[PDB]
Structures are given as C-alpha cells and as structure tokens.
Amino acid sequence: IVEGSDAEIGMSPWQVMLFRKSPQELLCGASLISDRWVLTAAHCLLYPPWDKNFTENDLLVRIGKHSRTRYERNIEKISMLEKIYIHPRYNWRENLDRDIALMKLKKPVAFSDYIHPVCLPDRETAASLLQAGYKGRVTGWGNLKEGQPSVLQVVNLPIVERPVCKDSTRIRITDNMFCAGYKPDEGKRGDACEGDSGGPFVMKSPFNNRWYQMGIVSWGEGCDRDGKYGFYTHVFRLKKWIQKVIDQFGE
Amino acid sequence: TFGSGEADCGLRPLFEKKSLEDKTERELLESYIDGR
Amino acid sequence: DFEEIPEEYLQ
Ligand SMILES: NC(=[NH2+])c1ccc2[nH]c(-c3cccc(-c4ccccc4)c3[O-])cc2c1
Ligand code: NA
C-alpha cells in the first residue's frame, strides 16, 4: 500500500495472508467471508505468463495477523486448503477479467476478536455505495513504493468515474472491474501495490453499520503513479458464481 | 458467504460490537454525501 | 524475512 498508514489492531479482522510453503513467502492478500471460505484474486494462484499455477498443497492461509513477518503465536490461525476454485472465465490472457477465486479451508476456523468475516454485498448495498466519490478502504502487507511494511497498512480511496478509469490506460476495462484512487488534481495519494493483490476493498454501510467487501485488489500499472488508478474485481457482479460454488461444494 | 449473508458479518469485535470507531472510518462516511 | 512457523502446518 502506498501512502497508507498502519492499521489498528482488529481493524480488518477478515484480512487473510496467502503464504507459500517453500519458499516461505507472502504471496497475496485474501479475505475471510465465512468460517470455511476465503476469497482472493485468481491471478494469485494461476498466471501462466509467469508460470504461476499453485495447488492446494503449495499454500497456507494465515488469518488474524497484524505483523507481516512474525508468527503471531496465540493470535493468528494457519489453515490448509481443501479445494481451490478459480472463476471458469478468468481471463489471464488479456485483462484479468473475472480475477476471483474461492478457497475452501480444510477445517473451519474459530472467530475471535482478530478473526471475523466480512459481508458480501447485496444488489441494494452495491447500488447505494459503489458511486464515484465514495471512499472505500484497502488493506495489505504489499510494497510501500513501486520497502515493505512491518504491519498491515490501510488507505481509503475514492471510487472513480468509469470514463476516467478507461481514459487512464490502454487495457480494456470490463463491467467486472472498477478503479479507485485520487486524481492528479486532488492533492491526496494512495494505492495498493505488489503484494496487495487478492486483498479486500471494503466500505462501511451507513444504513446498518456493517462492512462489505465491494472489491478485490486486481491490478494497476505501477503504484500510485499520477494519472493511473488501481483496478479491483467487482464482487457483486460475480456473486452468483460465489453463491454457486459455495452451496454446490459446502458453506 | 452470500447476500446480507454470514449473519454477524462485518461487525468488528473491537469496534462496532463495542461502539468504538477506528481513526479514519469517518472519512468514509463523510464521503457518502453526509448523514442527515 | 519471515519468521519460522510451526512444522505441524507444513507436514
Ligand atoms: N498498483 C496496484 N493497484 C496494484 C495492485 C495489485 C498488484 N499486484 C501486483 C503484482 C505484481 C507482480 C506480481 C503479482 C502476482 C502475480 C502472480 C501471482 C501473485 C501475484 C502481483 O499481484 C502489482 C499490483 C499493483
Ligand atoms: Na494515481
């Protein structure tokens, strides 16, 4: 996260870390949506251009963390994966369209003051909150510049008007993506960066006080460059796929 | 899990559940065009 | 840079 601050303890209890076993390294961010399911970006698991194709057995999910490199004994939980489901139409060849994946944990995790699931939006919440100018929050242990943080970082970014998003790149934007960030002319900065992929973009409903995950960190061209924005997967538009694998393969 | 969803989702043990606000959530709420 | 995690989680 660039130009963000350290998070507070228990500020994002749904934040997850996808950790590789060998080498033992942070791979991506992810989020907890129930006691047995994690949501992340499909490119974190499959990206053939760079020969990336991970299997259950190669990953570990660390939940309840704050510190990036320490094993937070008695606070975090490490789970193994039972199954990984990538969106059948994830487009890694052209623009990472439908960059979403679900991971089923081997065993359910128990919630605590540091482990709690985020809500997935419903048509109405998406409708009222995904408006240009409204700010959302992104969290992650990714790069600070285009070193790394010791603690989870957070930054609040405004959603941008879709034309502005399309006119900032040469990549074809789809309705399954939205972009966020400040305009060169807004004197504020911030963006996600390498290592933040897969993590959550959330908003707090002023109607019922709950936090909803509206997006997943997907891509950007550089980090916090002026005139560019970060792109996020539109969770609500892919929710029927989510519903389907969950009630087709578990809960 | 699904819509509205999980049940107790989105209510943080250390904040909403105790009626405590984190330091920048107001920035979010203030951008959703005010609350009156 | 990461700290070692308990062997039981690799196995
Ligand atoms: N500026 C942004 N908004 C942004 C957001 C997410 C990102 N993820 C990355 C990223 C860069 C290199 C490799 C991966 C990657 C590739 C395959 C598997 C896992 C991560 C990234 O997610 C950069 C990147 C930049
Ligand atoms: Na920018």
Full 3-state SS string of A148-199: CCCECEEEEEEECCHHHHHCCCCCCCCCCEEEECCCHHHCCCCECCCCCCCC
* CATH fold for domain B1-36: Epsilon-Thrombin; Chain L (4.10.140)
Check whether residue A182 and residue A210 sit in a common domain: yes
Residues A36 and A7 in one domain: no
- Other Cβ atoms less than 10 A from the Cβ of A74: the count is 6
Structure tokens at A71: 């094993």
Measure CA A182 to chain center. 19
Q: What was the experiment behind these coordinates?
A: X-ray
Based on the fold, state whether residues A199 and A244 are members of the same structural domain. no
- Dist CA A40 CA A32 (whole Å): 9
Please tell me whether residue A52 adopts helix, strand or coil conformation. strand
Say what the resolution is, in angstroms. 1.6
Residue B21 to residue B30: CA distance in whole angstroms? 14
Residue A230, CA distances (Å) to A138, A166, A222 in order:
11, 12, 9
Q: Are residues A61 and A144 located together in one domain of the fold? A: no
The one catalytic residue in A97, A99, A196, A224 is A99
- Identify whether residues A83 and A142 lie together within a single domain: no
Residues A6 and A18 in one domain: no
> Peptide bond before A23: cis, by omega within 30 degrees of 0?
yes
> Taking the CB of residue A207, how many other CB atoms lie within 10 A of it?
11
> Sign of the C-alpha dihedral, residues A115, B9, A129, A231?
positive
Burial class of A145 by CB neighbour count within 10 A (0 to 12, 13 to 18, 19+): exposed
For A69, the domain range is 13-117+237-249
Select from A34, A129, A209 the Cβ nearest to the Cβ of B1.
A34
Check which CATH number belongs to the domain holding A3 and give it: 2.40.10.10
B chain contacts of residue A8, beta-carbon cutoff 8 Å:
22-23
How many A from CA of A217 to the centre of ligand 1?
8
The answer to whether residues A29 and A17 touch, using CB atoms and an 8 Å cutoff, is: yes
Strands (E), chain A: 5-6, 15-20, 25-32, 37-40, 46-47, 52-53, 59-63, 77-79, 81-86, 101-105, 135-140, 153-158, 177-180, 200-204, 211-219, 230-234
Pair A142, A225 in one domain:
yes
How far is residue A35's CA from residue A84's CA, in Å, rounded to a whole number? 15
Neighbours of B, requiring at least 3 CB pairs below 8 Å, are A
CA–CA min distance A80, chain C (Å)? 8
Interface of A with C in 79-98 (CB under 8 A): 80
- Please list, in sequence order, all residues whose beta carbon lies within 8 angstroms of the beta carbon of residue A68, skipping any fewer than 6 positions away: A26, A141, A148, A149, A150, A151, A152
Instruction: Kindly tell me the burial class for residue A113, based on how many C-beta atoms sit within 10 Å of its own C-beta (0-12, 13-18, 19 or more).
Output: middle
Taking residue C6's Cβ as centre, other Cβ atoms within 10 Å add up to 10
Q: Do A192 and A109 share a domain, yes or no?
A: no
Domain tally for chain A? Answer: 2
Q: Dihedral sign, CA of A6, A41, A61, A26? A: negative
How buried is A133 (Cβ within 10 angstroms: 0-12 exposed, 13-18 middle, 19+ buried)? exposed
> Which residue intervals of chain A are DSSP H helices?
123-129, 162-166, 235-249
**In the numeric block, which tokens belong to residue B22?**
């984190």
- Mark whether A229 and A158 lie in a shared domain: yes
Chain discontinuities in chain C, listed by preceding residue (C to N exceeding 2.5 Å): none
